[PDB]
Amino acid sequence: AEKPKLHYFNGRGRMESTRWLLAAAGVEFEEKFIKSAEDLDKLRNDGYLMFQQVPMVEIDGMKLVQTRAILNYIASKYNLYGKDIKERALIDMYIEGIADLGEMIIMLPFCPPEEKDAKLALIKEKIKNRYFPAFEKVLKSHGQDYLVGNKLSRADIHLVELLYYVEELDSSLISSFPLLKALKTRISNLPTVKKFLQPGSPRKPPPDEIYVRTVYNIF
């Protein structure tokens, strides 16, 4: 059985939460980068893409598409999805809030220039008034090092990845949230995450204008 092989553009977009989770889990993977519309159309025409889209991951005999299908499978396989049905409800609730905020961040570079200020201001408002208070409250309420079950789960990994993007956006947004600051440091120091955070890993950068244009070209 192979290393999982990740099909996506050479950028963050919709594959980056899978790169984080696999790296957090200590799992070696390979990437086949889509550089053109022709690369994508060949995957489609070869029947690799159930819904004609990427992300797609080749893992344990499957060609899985859909971010959540990929991540649930990885989380479940590497015991990062809790130990029972009630922990999974907490985990799902948390990571779905993270996905919603995440989505706004992923979509942001693609919005018309005249809308950016308004959209960014709204993401900053939701971070401050909605999402950071929600997660700080979880940490504050049980006083434990991990969001759920007193042990590392995907929710920790997904949230910390998000705290890194929020820092790139505005380093002060986290300032009033000391338990989130502390979660970020703790998880960043786990050997697997520490290595993924270091130069030269598969961690992808923020999108620049050449990438924004390229992603269009790939559609």
Add this chain to the structure above:
Amino acid sequence: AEKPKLHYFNGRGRMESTRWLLAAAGVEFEEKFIKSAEDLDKLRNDGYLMFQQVPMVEIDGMKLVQTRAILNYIASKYNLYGKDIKERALIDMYIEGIADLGEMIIMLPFCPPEEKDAKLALIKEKIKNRYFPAFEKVLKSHGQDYLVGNKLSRADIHLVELLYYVEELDSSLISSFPLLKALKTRISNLPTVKKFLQPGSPRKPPPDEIYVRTVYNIFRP
């Protein structure tokens, strides 16, 4: 002890897939309809909405927000989430396709009249050229009555809900997809689903301009 209680507007939107799944699982539930901004504020103020949003379901002593958290819990509890990690992977892939389509459909009534025509045209095109082909191909690959593991799962339920909606929208779209038609018929005839499909059940109508205006009136009174 208590029935699940579903906190939403009195219409489909983001709660309908849950009404379908619970009914398919044989679970009677209650609904508490949010009618005003006051009602929404009370749920928030009581601290029952983790991200200040609905849907919310009170089930088994918990208050579950996020549509997918709600559905995953229900599907796991009532054995509609396949039998192993690999079946769940197939289930999740299939149903996330449905969710992408669903998300366009649910937002359609709150589009400006100017974007509506094109949005609808796009929806139909994706049904016909992307999603119905994908699901037909899966049913054809194995010739079995159910999408995954040759037994009823949440994927069948969520697909068939989608097929009922697509029928309302344009009843010709399914015409080229004989295996989807057959699945729709089989699943519709299962005791629990048949009961949910009957007149007078909790199944909700398609949204009308009053539902739309109630939703706006709640978020922007």
